[PDB]
């Protein structure tokens, strides 16, 4: 069938000091895909990791093609945009909706950790939504393998986004990968339920973080969060990563299992 390999770039999804992401529409089928375009003037690694991803809550990678210095990565298109845009500033969103998004985020993280990959930059701006509002973890530009041949590798690279980063990355030379992503998911949960981030960074020098450690939950954003999810956040946002709740136990949490949301 002629022309089936032609795609028109019709809209800029994102542009930044890293390249751009365009919505591409197939000339013949009208199928929509996102195309990440990068001027190679790192890539090999993101591609390698993207090839391993096959799960309903992680953006699928279709393949790539290069022409000289430009690489074109074809990725599953999420027409609903960023989860960040469903969060109302200083309000959050309805708790049942947050719970459903949180269940999908955990499914995607469990999947990644199961294949030994840590994302390292989980935040609402990197969690996309498809046309049925299904969450999809995206942008594996900072991702890395933390388990290979059944052997865990401790991480030491400081990366991520400060408000979402776990305390051990700012205080320890090496740390386990999984609790770091779990922490980030807790901050995303806070944002979805309060419409605001709890601190600029989790350091003792940050007053908001000291208050949390001092359990002053009468202050924002905690005072906007119901007791059930707040009890889960008390288990996730724990400073010692060895004492922090693991995903298998988050799955047993009371709020996590409470019926709240009707099906579509």
């Amino acid at each position: 069938v002629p022309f089936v390999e032609d795609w028109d770039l019709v809209q800029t999804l994102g542009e930044g000091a890293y390249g751009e992401v365009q919505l591409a529409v197939n000339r013949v089928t009208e199928e929509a895909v996102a195309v990440k375009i990068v001027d190679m003037k790192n890539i090999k690694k993101e591609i390698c990791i993207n090839k391993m991803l096959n799960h309903e809550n992680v953006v699928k990678f279709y393949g790539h093609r290069r022409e000289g210095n430009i690489q074109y990565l074809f990725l599953e298109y999420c027409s609903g945009g960023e989860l960040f845009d469903r969060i109302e500033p200083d309000i959050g969103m309805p708790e049942p909706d947050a719970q459903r998004f949180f269940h999908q985020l955990m499914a995607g993280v469990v999947y990644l950790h199961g294949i030994g990959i840590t994302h390292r930059d989980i935040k609402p701006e990197n969690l996309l939504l498809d046309e049925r509002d299904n969450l999809k973890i995206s942008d594996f530009g900072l991702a890395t393998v933390f388990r290979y041949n059944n052997r865990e590798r401790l991480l030491n690279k400081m990366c991520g986004t400060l408000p979402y980063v776990a305390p051990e990355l700012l205080k320890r030379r090496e740390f386990h990968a999984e609790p770091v992503d779990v922490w980030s998911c807790g901050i995303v949960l806070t944002a979805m339920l309060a419409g605001e981030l709890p601190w600029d960074q989790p350091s003792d020098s940050c007053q908001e973080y000291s208050d949390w450690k001092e359990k002053k939950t009468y202050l924002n954003p905690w005072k906007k969060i119901d007791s059930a999810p707040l009890a889960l956040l008390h288990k996730i946002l724990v400073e010692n990563p060895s004492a922090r709740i693991t995903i298998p136990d988050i799955k047993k949490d009371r709020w996590y299992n409470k019926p709240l949301k009707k099906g579509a």
Partner: peptide, 5 residues
């Protein structure tokens, strides 16, 4: 603007 697959 276009690209091939």
């Amino acid at each position: 603007a276009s690209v091939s697959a």
